[PDB]
Amino acid sequence: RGSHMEDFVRQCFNPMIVELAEKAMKEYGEDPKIETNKFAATCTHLEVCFMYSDGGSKHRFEIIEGRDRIMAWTVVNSICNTTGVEKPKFLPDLYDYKENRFIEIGVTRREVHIYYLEKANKIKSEKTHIHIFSFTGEEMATKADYTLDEESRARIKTRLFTIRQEMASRSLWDSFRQSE
Amino acid sequence: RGSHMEDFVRQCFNPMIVELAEKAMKEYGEDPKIETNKFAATCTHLEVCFMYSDGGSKHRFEIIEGRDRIMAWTVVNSICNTTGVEKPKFLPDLYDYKENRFIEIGVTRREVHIYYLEKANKIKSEKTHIHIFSFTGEEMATKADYTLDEESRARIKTRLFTIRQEMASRSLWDSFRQSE
Amino acid sequence: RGSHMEDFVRQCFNPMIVELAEKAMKEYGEDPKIETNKFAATCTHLEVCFMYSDGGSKHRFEIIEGRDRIMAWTVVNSICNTTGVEKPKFLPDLYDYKENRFIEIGVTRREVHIYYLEKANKIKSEKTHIHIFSFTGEEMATKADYTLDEESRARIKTRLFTIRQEMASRSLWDSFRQSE
Amino acid sequence: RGSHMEDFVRQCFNPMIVELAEKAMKEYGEDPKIETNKFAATCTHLEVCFMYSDGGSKHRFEIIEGRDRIMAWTVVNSICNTTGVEKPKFLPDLYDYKENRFIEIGVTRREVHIYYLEKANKIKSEKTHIHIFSFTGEEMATKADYTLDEESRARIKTRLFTIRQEMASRSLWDSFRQSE
Ligand SMILES: O=C1NCCc2cccc(c2)OCCCCOc2cccc(c2)C2=NC(=O)C(O)C1=N2
Ligand SMILES: O=C1NCCc2cccc(c2)OCCCCOc2cccc(c2)C2=NC(=O)C(O)C1=N2
Ligand SMILES: O=C1NCCc2cccc(c2)OCCCCOc2cccc(c2)C2=NC(=O)C(O)C1=N2
Ligand SMILES: O=C1NCCc2cccc(c2)OCCCCOc2cccc(c2)C2=NC(=O)C(O)C1=N2
Ligand SMILES: [Mn+2]
Ligand SMILES: [Mn+2]
Ligand SMILES: [Mn+2]
Ligand SMILES: [Mn+2]
Ligand SMILES: [Mn+2]
Ligand SMILES: [Mn+2]
Ligand SMILES: [Mn+2]
Ligand SMILES: [Mn+2]
Numbered sequence: 001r002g003s004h005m006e007d008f009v010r011q012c013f014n015p016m017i018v019e020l021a022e023k024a025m026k027e028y029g030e031d032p033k034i035e036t037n038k039f040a041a042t043c044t045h046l047e048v049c050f051m052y053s054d055g056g057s058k059h060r061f062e063i064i065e066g067r068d069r070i071m072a073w074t075v076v077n078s079i080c081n082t083t084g085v086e087k088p089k090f091l092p093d094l095y096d097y098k099e100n101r102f103i104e105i106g107v108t109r110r111e112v113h114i115y116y117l118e119k120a121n122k123i124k125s126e127k128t129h130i131h132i133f134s135f136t137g138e139e140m141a142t143k144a145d146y147t148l149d150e151e152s153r154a155r156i157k158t159r160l161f162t163i164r165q166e167m168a169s170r171s172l173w174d175s176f177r178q179s180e
Numbered sequence: 181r182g183s184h185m186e187d188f189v190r191q192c193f194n195p196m197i198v199e200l201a202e203k204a205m206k207e208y209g210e211d212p213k214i215e216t217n218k219f220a221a222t223c224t225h226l227e228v229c230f231m232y233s234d235g236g237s238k239h240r241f242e243i244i245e246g247r248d249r250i251m252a253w254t255v256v257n258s259i260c261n262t263t264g265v266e267k268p269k270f271l272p273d274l275y276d277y278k279e280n281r282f283i284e285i286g287v288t289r290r291e292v293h294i295y296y297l298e299k300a301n302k303i304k305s306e307k308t309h310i311h312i313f314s315f316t317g318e319e320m321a322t323k324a325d326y327t328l329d330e331e332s333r334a335r336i337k338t339r340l341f342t343i344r345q346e347m348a349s350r351s352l353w354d355s356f357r358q359s360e
Numbered sequence: 361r362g363s364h365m366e367d368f369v370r371q372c373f374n375p376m377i378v379e380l381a382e383k384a385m386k387e388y389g390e391d392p393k394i395e396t397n398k399f400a401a402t403c404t405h406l407e408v409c410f411m412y413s414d415g416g417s418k419h420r421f422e423i424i425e426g427r428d429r430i431m432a433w434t435v436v437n438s439i440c441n442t443t444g445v446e447k448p449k450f451l452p453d454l455y456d457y458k459e460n461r462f463i464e465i466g467v468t469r470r471e472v473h474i475y476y477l478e479k480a481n482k483i484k485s486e487k488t489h490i491h492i493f494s495f496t497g498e499e500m501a502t503k504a505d506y507t508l509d510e511e512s513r514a515r516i517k518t519r520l521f522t523i524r525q526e527m528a529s530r531s532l533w534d535s536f537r538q539s540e
Numbered sequence: 541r542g543s544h545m546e547d548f549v550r551q552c553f554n555p556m557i558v559e560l561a562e563k564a565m566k567e568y569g570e571d572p573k574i575e576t577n578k579f580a581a582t583c584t585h586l587e588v589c590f591m592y593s594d595g596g597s598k599h600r601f602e603i604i605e606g607r608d609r610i611m612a613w614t615v616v617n618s619i620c621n622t623t624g625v626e627k628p629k630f631l632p633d634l635y636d637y638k639e640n641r642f643i644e645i646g647v648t649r650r651e652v653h654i655y656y657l658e659k660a661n662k663i664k665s666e667k668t669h670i671h672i673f674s675f676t677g678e679e680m681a682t683k684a685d686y687t688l689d690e691e692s693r694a695r696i697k698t699r700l701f702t703i704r705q706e707m708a709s710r711s712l713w714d715s716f717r718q719s720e
Binding site for chain 2: 594676690691692694697698699700706
Binding site: 155159166 | 419437457
């Protein structure tokens with residue numbers, strides 16, 4: 001295919017993130033060489049989920065994103081069967097052992113307002129906490145409970161805007177923006 | 181022997197846990213290739229003991245389980261001879277430098293209620309703290325003092341239920357359950 | 361060139377610091393083999409900046425010094441575009457996610473009093489926090505807010521005086537002092 | 541020489557401790573192959589000093605023991621010239637950046653009472669904090685200020701008694717005891 005977006009994704013993100021995103025897309029019938037915008041988004045979503053899990057105390061989070069579908073659901077079942085929390089219909093991204101709730105992390109190129117609306121209406125488990133990040137430095141969380149402290153969330157916002165700058169410097173941002 | 185339980189234990193637990201469990205069983209005249217249920221249980225008990233020791237503050241715990249019998253008793257003697265705590269008749273699993281007591285960690289396929297009864301009656305040192313975990317997500321500790329915080333114990337419960345699911349998915353749980 | 365200062369810098373600082381200082385000087389048209397005093401100063405400034413970033417809590421600081429000019433400004437733009445802080449005219453050394461301000465770290469062979477005066481007058485962004493260290497063990501910070509706790513700053517002062525002793529023992533301090 | 545004490549020291553302590561003790565003894569005209577009791581004591585003293593430095597918060601301690609005489613005094617001079625603390629006449633073992641004092645750590649086979657007396661009378665700098673450990677599990681510190689918390693000191697006491705047991709099991713304790 002020879003996409004410019006593909007070579008930028010491989011130099012922007014670390015090899016473990018790229019490998020997990022490639023495996024995730026292929027598992028769902030998506031090709032990272034063609035759907036290069038989806039390739040960038042899944043890497044971005046993966047890195048955001050991992051910085052998020054690094055922001056709290058040790059042992060605080062259980063990472064669901066980044067596993068295969070079967071093993072991700074297996075850990076969800078164990079979390080539900082040991083904490084009594086209701087089983088979510090869709091795969092979440094983390095579990096907060098402190099607040100005892102699942103977290104769905106979103107990363108959007110639109111307003112954080114409209115994307116949360118889509119995710120809140122998509123998921124039926126109203127117990128699942130939602131936390132949205134934008135590429136412009138905005139965020140929005142369920143009940144205005146942002147889970148982490150200010151500095152951990154600020155790192156994610158800074159990293160997101162750096163990716164945007166790197167994309168625009170290569171004339172790839174406009175195609176990435178009008179693709180969500 | 182060629183046991184399905186053997187190959188699952190080697191892929192479920194990390195190689196250091198398997199090696200320590202193999203050495204522990206052989207030291208007591210048990211063969212991991214035949215007593216494959218005991219092989220799974222000792223690996224599970226070993227991993228639970230190590231996650232437990234990782235749950236507290238640094239330097240808080242002294243790990244007794246996972247050593248050879250002679251060296252495990254040597255550290256117990258040093259702990260007793262330096263803290264004044266009475267020497268337990270049976271080998272415990274950890275020592276809590278914070279609460280100044282030995283901890284016996286149990287992992288059961290039955291009710292956490294009955295297993296503690298067996299361990300409390302087995303040990304005569306009533307000073308030794310007892311902490312039981314089940315594969316269903318229940319726990320029970322001496323004086324209702326669970327030592328660690330909620331999230332460290334929840335990780336162990338989640339991990340235990342994941343092992344149960346992995347066993348049942350391979351049709352090995354029923355033999356493991358009716359073997360304790 | 362065969363400078364004694366060059367061989368001391370390579371044995372005093374760790375190879376990653378030397379490599380970053382060499383790249384920084386060459387990027388600005390300076391040669392570490394000739395401008396050996398500048399070579400020592402940039403290594404010292406780099407090490408001080410990194411010990412500083414290690415002094416606070418995790419995630420607290422964003423390191424700007426030690427990057428290439430383009431990437432350093434790219435992260436600054438993301439920090440400004442996500443926190444609303446005004447863009448500084450000159451490249452700072454760190455960003456404090458806790459106090460929400462940029463930090464300019466200085467290391468001087470003169471009085472900490474006069475060097476801050478030069479840096480305060482050089483920078484127009486009065487929001488940028490200034491923190492000066494001397495080779496004699498003195499420090500001076502904006503609004504007397506020294507950011508870190510006492511022990512993290514004391515380590516830097518101790519390290520600075522050790523470098524001075526190592527220089528004087530090799531008869532290189534006097535040339536280094538009367539060069540700033 | 542072929543000493544039993546020599547081979548036990550090499551299997552009891554980690555190779556970095558043995559190497560530092562060997563270098564320390566040779567620097568003072570002592571041979572680890574002959575003065576095997578001194579070899580064991582210097583390894584024990586070195587390990588105790590390092591567990592001690594690991595007991596406090598990060599950045600809290602500056603390790604003086606384990607360096608060459610010239611570099612150990614160079615760091616002492618920098619600590620004194622930056623904190624204003626008086627220069628000790630004899631090399632201490634650590635510096636407490638929290639309490640702003642040097643620490644002399646002793647390890648004795650006699651009563652902690654008599655050994656402190658020798659060290660307090662040896663050193664003239666009454667500012668230098670003294671902390672003694674015994675192989676029986678006793679300790680004694682200046683002004684009853686034990687610096688670290690209870691659990692960090694208990695680890696050192698446990699480790700000391702384990703070394704004693706390992707020595708006595710090899711019939712080397714009695715020669716080690718009546719050698720101090
Ligand atoms: O967890 C998730 N799993 C999805 C795995 C996946 C990978 C590749 C293709 C695909 C599914 O099909 C897309 C189905 C229609 C959904 O449209 C999108 C588009 C882009 C991102 C997301 C969803 C998304 N955002 C998140 O925040 C997530 O957590 C999350 N997906
Ligand atoms: O510490 C322990 N050391 C035992 C070492 C050992 C290994 C292999 C065989 C064996 C002994 O013989 C069994 C003797 C009869 C005891 O029956 C069992 C069966 C299964 C687990 C345990 C005990 C057990 N549960 C714990 O919780 C422990 O801590 C613990 N053992
Ligand atoms: O961030 C910085 N970037 C400068 C990068 C650089 C490297 C090599 C040569 C050069 C610039 O040209 C010098 C231009 C005139 C400035 O004179 C000096 C001399 C010595 C140190 C500094 C400035 C300095 N002190 C700091 O504290 C800094 O943070 C800092 N520089
Ligand atoms: O720091 C120290 N540096 C000494 C370096 C050294 C190594 C080998 C031989 C030697 C000196 O000559 C001995 C001179 C007479 C002193 O007798 C002893 C005997 C055994 C231990 C100590 C002192 C001692 N105890 C501590 O606690 C220390 O801190 C400490 N030494
Ligand atoms: Mn997801
Ligand atoms: Mn998500
Ligand atoms: Mn046990
Ligand atoms: Mn047990
Ligand atoms: Mn700078
Ligand atoms: Mn600077
Ligand atoms: Mn000493
Ligand atoms: Mn000493």
